[PDB]
Design a protein around this nucleic acid. Sequence first.
RNA 1: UACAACAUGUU
RNA 2: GAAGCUGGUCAAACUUGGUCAUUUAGAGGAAGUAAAAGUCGUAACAAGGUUUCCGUAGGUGAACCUGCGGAAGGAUCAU
RNA 3: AGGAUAGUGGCCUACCAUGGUUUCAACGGGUAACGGGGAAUAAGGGUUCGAUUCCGGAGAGGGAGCCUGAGAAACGGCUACCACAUCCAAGGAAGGCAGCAGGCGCGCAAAUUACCCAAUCCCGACACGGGGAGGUAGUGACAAUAAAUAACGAUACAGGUUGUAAUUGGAAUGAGUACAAUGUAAAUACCUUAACGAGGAACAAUUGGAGGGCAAGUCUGGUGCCAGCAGCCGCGGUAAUUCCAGCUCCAAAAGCGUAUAUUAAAGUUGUUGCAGUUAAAAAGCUCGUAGUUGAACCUUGGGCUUGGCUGGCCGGUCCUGGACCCAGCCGAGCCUUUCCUUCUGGCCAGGACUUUUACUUUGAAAAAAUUAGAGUGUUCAAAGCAGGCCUUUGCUCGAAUAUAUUAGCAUGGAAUAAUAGAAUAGGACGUUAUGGUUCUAUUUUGUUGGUUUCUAGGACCAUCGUAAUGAUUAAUAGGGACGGUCGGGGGUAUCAGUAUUCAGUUGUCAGAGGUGAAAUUCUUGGAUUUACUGAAGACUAACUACUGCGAAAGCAUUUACCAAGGACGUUUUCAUUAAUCAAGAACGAAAGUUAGGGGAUCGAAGAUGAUCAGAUACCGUCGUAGUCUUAACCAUAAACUAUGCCGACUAGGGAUCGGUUGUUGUUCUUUUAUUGACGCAAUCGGCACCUUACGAGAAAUCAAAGUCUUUGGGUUCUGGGGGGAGUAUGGUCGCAAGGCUGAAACUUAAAGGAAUUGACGGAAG
RNA 4: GGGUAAACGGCGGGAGUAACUAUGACUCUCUUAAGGUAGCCAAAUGCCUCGUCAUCUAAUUAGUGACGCGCAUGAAUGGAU
RNA 5: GAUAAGGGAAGUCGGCAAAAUAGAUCCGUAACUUCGGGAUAAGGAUUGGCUCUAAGGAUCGGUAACGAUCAACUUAGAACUGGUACGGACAAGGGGAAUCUGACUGUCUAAUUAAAACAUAGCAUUG
Lengths: 143, 129, 150
Amino acid sequence: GKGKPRGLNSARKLRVHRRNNRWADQAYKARLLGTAFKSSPFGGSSHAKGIVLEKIGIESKQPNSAIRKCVRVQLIKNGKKVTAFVPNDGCLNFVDENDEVLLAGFGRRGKAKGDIPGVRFKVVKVSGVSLLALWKEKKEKPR
Amino acid sequence: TRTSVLADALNAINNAEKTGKRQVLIRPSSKVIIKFLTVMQKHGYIGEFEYIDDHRSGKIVVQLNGRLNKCGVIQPRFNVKINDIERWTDNLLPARQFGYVILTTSAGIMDHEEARRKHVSGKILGFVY
Amino acid sequence: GRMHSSGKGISSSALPYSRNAPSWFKLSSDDVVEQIIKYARKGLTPSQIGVILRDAHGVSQAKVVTGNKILRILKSNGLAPEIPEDLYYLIKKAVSVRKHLEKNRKDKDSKFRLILIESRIHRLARYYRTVAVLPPNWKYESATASALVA
RNA sequence: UACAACAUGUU
RNA sequence: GAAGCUGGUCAAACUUGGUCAUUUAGAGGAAGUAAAAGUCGUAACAAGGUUUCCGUAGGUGAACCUGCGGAAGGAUCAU
RNA sequence: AGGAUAGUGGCCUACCAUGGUUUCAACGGGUAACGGGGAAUAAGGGUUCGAUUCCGGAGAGGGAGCCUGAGAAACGGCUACCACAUCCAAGGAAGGCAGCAGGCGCGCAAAUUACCCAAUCCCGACACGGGGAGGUAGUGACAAUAAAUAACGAUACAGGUUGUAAUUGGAAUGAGUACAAUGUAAAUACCUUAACGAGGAACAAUUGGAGGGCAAGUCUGGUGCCAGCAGCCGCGGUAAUUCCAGCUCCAAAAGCGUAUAUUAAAGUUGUUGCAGUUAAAAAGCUCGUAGUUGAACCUUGGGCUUGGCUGGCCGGUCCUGGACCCAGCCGAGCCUUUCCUUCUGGCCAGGACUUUUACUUUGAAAAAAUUAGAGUGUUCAAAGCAGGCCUUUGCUCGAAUAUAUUAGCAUGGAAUAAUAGAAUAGGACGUUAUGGUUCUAUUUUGUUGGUUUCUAGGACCAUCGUAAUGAUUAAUAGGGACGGUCGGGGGUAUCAGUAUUCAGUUGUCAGAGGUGAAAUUCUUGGAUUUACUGAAGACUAACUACUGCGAAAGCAUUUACCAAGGACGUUUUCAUUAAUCAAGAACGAAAGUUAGGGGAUCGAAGAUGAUCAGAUACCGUCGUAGUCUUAACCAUAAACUAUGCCGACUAGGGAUCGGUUGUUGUUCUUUUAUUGACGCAAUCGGCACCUUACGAGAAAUCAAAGUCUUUGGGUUCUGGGGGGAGUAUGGUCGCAAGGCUGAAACUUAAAGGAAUUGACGGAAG
RNA sequence: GGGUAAACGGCGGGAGUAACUAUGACUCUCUUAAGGUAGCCAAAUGCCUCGUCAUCUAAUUAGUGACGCGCAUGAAUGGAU
RNA sequence: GAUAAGGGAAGUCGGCAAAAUAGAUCCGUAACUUCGGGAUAAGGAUUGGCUCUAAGGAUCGGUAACGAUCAACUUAGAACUGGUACGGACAAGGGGAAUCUGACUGUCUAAUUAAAACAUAGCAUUG
Ligand SMILES: CN[C@@H]1[C@@H](O)[C@@H](O[C@@H]2[C@@H](O)[C@H](O[C@H]3O[C@H]([C@@H](C)O)[C@@H](O)[C@H](O)[C@H]3N)[C@@H](N)C[C@H]2N)OC[C@]1(C)O
Ligand SMILES: CN[C@@H]1[C@@H](O)[C@@H](O[C@@H]2[C@@H](O)[C@H](O[C@H]3O[C@H]([C@@H](C)O)[C@@H](O)[C@H](O)[C@H]3N)[C@@H](N)C[C@H]2N)OC[C@]1(C)O
Ligand SMILES: CN[C@@H]1[C@@H](O)[C@@H](O[C@@H]2[C@@H](O)[C@H](O[C@H]3O[C@H]([C@@H](C)O)[C@@H](O)[C@H](O)[C@H]3N)[C@@H](N)C[C@H]2N)OC[C@]1(C)O
């Protein structure tokens, strides 16, 4: 029984069977296809830089009602366009069109977070200074 | 078809044991079955067992004393180093003070403690406790 | 169970325990052998010979009254068939099915049974070539099938 | 015989 | 015994054609997904008001309808 | 065979042969691949990382070709071309930082164009010189070790003997600075240290949190589904413990948070060890090669002697051990028909022999570093491999020890699983059985080179001499035969049957049809309705069921023929021929396709009447394909038992179909047999059903979905949250319709299963 | 009075309507024998017209690919391949 | 009827006209397809003379697998050789990517139109 061979000379069948079915696991399949290198916006990097193209407000999904401030960003390494959330109260006024921002993942390894639809990145720095410093008035926006 | 007569014998013994039967009929018999049954009897887990000659393969009637929890085969008969017996006894046996892992060795069929005394090893055959 | 169906019948002849001839049976071993040779020479497969012996001469098993089996006796007196009777009968059945089918091209069940019969033929021929009973390059083919049964 | 549908979000 | 010469040998590089791998632009077309309160109907869930579903073939703004053959996961374990 | 090389070799050449690798995965493609020593995690088994301190390889912008030399196809050597790039008086010339430092670029991502040969060590003609090798400092929150930011009194308090309070003093000191020496090649720093060096001891600790997971507020103010928070569940709509702040509190602290990859948690990759009736998942069904796996059986029992270890009567107790005894375990030798190669020296040292393997034991050997681990007051620790003493002309322990082992080489065992043997005997032993030949040969007439068989030894060829002369059961595995049957199993002809439609003849007159109710329609040219005859195609009612057969799809009138099949019965036969199966094949409802033939009836589409808000729907009337058949395609269904196949076992009962075996107060032949039906007990096979819950399960339920954490009989296929999607693409099959194979981006917190309570139903009572 | 389109042939207008706008799945009404279906297209068939967009070129009333309220495409007056 | 530096369709309504290709042997050959084709697709190499060598037979005569006698031009290979020539004259396809259109072979306006026209097989209708 058990639907798997048990013969003592059946190692090839067991090993090949495990190899075939490991393709059904998402992490294994991603790391063997190299999807991060080929299709991830960051190319497998943890962070990336880009130029702000426009400010956009995104309607929060139900049962929430809000406008989540985000920026449309064109990456430097590959020219890809991504949307990044600018996290804190009033931190959108710190970023402007044509600024250079540092982006990071948004905590869920390629997924959206919370009630913000379709946003998988967050702004970390603008013009070479972190938003956490600017928000707390610990530094100043360079010019 | 029939691929391990030892497996059929030990399954029949265990099933008869669980139902409260005092006796179980084993068919067919073989030298390996008889040696395994002898190992189980020498430790008291079974009583008298009797071999019937049918001129074909033999039958065995075993007297079960109700002292047996589990008998079973380890199939396939894995090769076991001298110092890989530790993991087999840890995985198959209820505790480190009773129960036996039956090995077939070039010195003959025996349990694992006898194998340690004689410093011999071979292929795993089954277990009893 | 049945090799080419789902049947699980167990209806088989049950050999007696005793390996000696009954005390009431008194025929010479040489007599039984010459009876076997006479029956084979008229033309009778070992199964047919055993049936006749058991039915009309009290010869339960020719093994217990001669010490050797019928087909072995025939091989020791130059009466072994060129084709073993198992394979001969399978080829004959296949020939009969093929000749039926050549007229009834719409009998699809007969085609399916032909496939089964020929599979059994090839498996048996493989076995016989392994034990060197048949020549190493022996081969069943439908075109020459009627020859070996003729 | 006939009978369609009931805005969003909770506590 | 220098330049140089003859014939080979290894063979860079270029031109043309083939071939394999990876990336990539595009009028237009056809999808998918996401997004508090827009429109049309009401197909499913109760026999959901024509029981539902599967395969196949037509038809139709849309859900869908109809033919043929199946299933009960039926609304009948039963005369 | 040659040439070439330092040398072997298709390394190259000439001639010749047709070989070499491959489902036990060759060849090709990808690698965001230099390999290993090693690293993290770590019950075990595993998973992942290793450019990088050591070892091996390769390269010096890209290729190629060379000189020199022992050694290079060298690049801080040459030659050429390509690409880069430099100077110029325009003729020409000079290049190679993947060496150190430094610059530009690239990017999320990485330090000084510093000092020096003092140490490690290398090179040279060399004790002397050189070395960006190396060492020293600079930068340096990669990682790691230790470790401040305060300590103690008295007054007033207070408590129930000090656990608790503000304001009252005196000390303590290292951060920092700096003589000095030390450290060093010279410095810097450490370490020692003179003088300095603390009350807000401002010489002032931060980073994240305070609804739950998860430790810590319903305190205050602001905002009012906005702004924002929130990994997840959620918070926010005018009393927010969740946002922005203040206070207070919590956690870790010289560190804390965030992002990405990865490991454990994950028994969510499962060999150990998952799941597949309904949650994802058994191929529609059979055949079948590779693969995996495969019934039992061949030296078993007995006796004597004897070595070592454990506990006990001797006790002998100083944890030590003693004749012998009670036991137990592990060894060795002979005998039992006795396996162990055979002969020569005479328990080692020689010739001639040797069926192959897997498996398991034991050894040699196996770079350091790293791991584990013994020693050792680096002030502790990380570390390092040092160090410690009687005090100097010195002495002294050390720098352990384990792990390595898949493969290879040695080595005991002979169970388990294989492998070969004597069957047309071409079979084993004859050593001292005889002969014929022939070969190799010592001893020889030893004075040098000759003979041939008695001769020594192989080696052939016969005759004869011994032997117990030589073949395992036939499996409640399989295959085959034989006997009587049993089937709506298949195929081909053949016989029916009513019904429907359409007719042609007969007769009467106002309607007929259809529905919940109508209308379209047909009707005095008589519609509908009645009787007779006839013509067409279908279909096979009633019998007909918890019944049969078939691999499945399916299969139902009579009869005959054809070949096929399960089960049963058998004291017939072969002897492992078997199970499951990638690849590869047969069949496969309905619908659909092509061409003929038929086209009664129903009837997709279409036309049309109603209902309706609208219904191009349900309902009514027609009606084209189709429905049927022949010859070919198509290959899909809720093709379902949503339950793979083979095998074994586990609990009670009553029926039923087929076969066989024993048997009556019954019906029928005849009232009587070798009648048939029926009735009563046993069995083998089936289709099923009933009760219980052994046991299983999330439950529904299940005699299998049981014998599964007490996890292992054999084997094939499938699934890994929901979607995107059975989509795109390539391939392939098809006339087409379509079938088979079959992704990814992206998106999302549930989707889903079974059951409970309630509510609801154009559901029942 | 009935049948017949692989006979000749034919195969429509006007209003409103979706939470930016625009468009109009949806609705109403007039009317026909039927109101152009499947396809195809500035085509040897499109006036406006050298239509608009893309491609081709240094530059294209040419070519090709698209789009389609198409003066006046369209199914054996055979449609599309 | 010829040739022409450099350019190469800028000429022209338009490559009209002309040029270029061309035999044979070997190599290599895409989309698409009614599976028959497309195809000489595209696109490469070779070719003289001379001196040789090898292979491919017939009839006689007895392991005859041989000896003797006779005989036709095909094919393949090698050496040598030249102002690199050599299908040396002659003879002799240019090719590719698409659109429109008629399926195809075929036929007609003798004396201005050869076509997309006519015919055709196939399909349908009528008596
Ligand atoms: C395109 N996705 C593929 C998916 O199709 C599938 O690939 C299988 C592949 O695993 C199979 O191949 C597999 O199984 C065979 C077995 C049959 O012998 C093995 O020999 C082989 O090693 C093994 N890779 C191959 N035979 C068919 C593909 N569709 O699984 C692998 C994948 C990458 O996810
Ligand atoms: C359930 N079937 C629905 C069908 O009903 C329809 O639903 C729309 C829905 O999509 C609209 O909603 C949509 O559009 C609105 C907005 C842009 O108008 C968005 O805010 C909203 O997120 C989005 N879901 C909703 N406002 C009306 C429904 N009838 O949308 C198509 C559909 C998926 O087939
Ligand atoms: C974590 N704290 C809890 C939280 O669970 C909250 O959740 C409810 C939730 O159950 C409601 O319920 C929702 O629950 C499911 C699912 C997401 O749970 C939703 O898919 C669905 O819309 C709805 N049924 C939803 N309206 C939001 C909160 N009010 O219920 C109250 C709470 C104390 O705030």
